[PDB]
């Protein structure tokens, strides 16, 4: 699947945005909510963040002191994926964002929405995620995750998001979307290098596990080769398609470097 002559993303302003040369500060915010005790409880979501954590540390050079992990089985009330905890942790990831950084975000939990064909008044806020205290604080909507994690990024900074949740296809309000059903593309900008993986638009945690295994068993991939490999990796055991959303047009033949 890798192209014959694959040139890494061009290290210059394009047309308005700029990519990341994936060498700057490598931070990660990892969220796994299992909703223990509740009548809508889940299993494996906490284990998913662990999987992303140690993969990021081993094959991606992410130091643990740069990684915040919110999981509800922890003991530290600061690290329990409460809404204020999730929000504050998102502000930290994006804080001091500079060109060419390698931020990573991961979420494994409940996805849903308050729907609308396109976003206004229900401004952009169709997709949502549920903090562990969502029953008494409300969900964390599509728009707020844009204002926090995308806007405060300057030109050149890469945020690499990964959603294992369902109904989270446009959960970062990303303008562009790339799929692999005949190579689909599906359209206030930001020059940052924001990309995101998600499924379909309920078996959860499929998208992270396919990603580690696609990137462990073949570390050299293009934006294109990634999506076919994820589709073969998913279409066997899980019914959903990979969706790489983005904040800018991506010539998918470039080298995806994480
Ligand atoms: Ca949206
Ligand atoms: Cl678990």
Residue numbers in the entry: 69 to 83, 88 to 259, 310 to 323, 336 to 392
Paper text:
Metacaspases are caspase-like homologs which undergo a complex maturation process involving multiple intra-chain cleavages resulting in a composite enzyme made of a p10 and a p20 domain. Their proteolytic activity involving a cysteine-histidine catalytic dyad, show peptide bond cleavage specificity in the C-terminal to lysine and arginine, with both maturation- and catalytic processes being calcium-dependent. Here, we present the structure of a metacaspase from the yeast Candida glabrata, CgMCA-I, in complex with a unique calcium along with a structure in which three magnesium ions are bound. The monomers CgMCA-ICa and CgMCA-IMg both contain a p20 and a p10 domain forming a caspase-like core in which a two-stranded anti-parallel β-sheet from the p10 domain completes a six stranded parallel β-sheet in the p20 domain.
To determine the structure of CgMCA-ICa, we purified the wild-type metacaspase in the presence of 10 mM CaCl2 and performed crystallization assays at day 0 using a non-fully maturated protein. Crystals were observed only after three months, and the crystal structure reveals that the maturation process occurred in the course of the crystallization. Regarding the maturation process, the N-terminal and the linker located between p20 and p10 domains and which corresponds to the CgL6 loop, are both cleaved and residues Met1 to Gly68 and Asn260 to Ile309 show no electron density in the 2Fo-Fc map. Surprisingly, the two monomers of the CgMCA-ICa dimer observed in the asymmetric unit interact via a β-sheet complementation between the β6 and β5’ strands. This unexpected organization being similar to that of the dimer usually observed for caspases, SAXS experiments were performed to determine the oligomeric state of CgMCA-I in the presence of calcium and confirmed that this enzyme is monomeric in solution. In addition, as observed in the crystal structure of ScMCA-I16, loop CgL7 (named L3 in ScMCA-I), which may cap the substrate-binding groove, is disordered from Asp324 to Gly335. We observed a clear electron density for Ca2+. In CgMCA-ICa, Ca2+ is hepta-coordinated by a water molecule and residues Gly196, Asp198 (Asp173 in TbMCA-Ib), Asp214 (Asp189 in TbMCA-Ib), Thr242 and Asp245 (Asp220 in TbMCA-Ib). Interestingly, the “cation binding loop” observed in ScMCA-I (Gln223-Asp237) and in TbMCA-Ib (Cys162-Asp173) is ordered in CgMCA-ICa which suggests that the calcium has probably a role of stabilization not only for loop Asn185-Asp199 but also for segment Asp236- Asp245, the whole contributing to bringing together the two catalytic residues. Interestingly, in the presence of Mg2+ the distance between the two catalytic residues is 10.6 Å, against 8.3 Å when in presence of Ca2+, suggesting that the presence of calcium forces the catalytic site to adopt a proper organization for its autolysis activity.
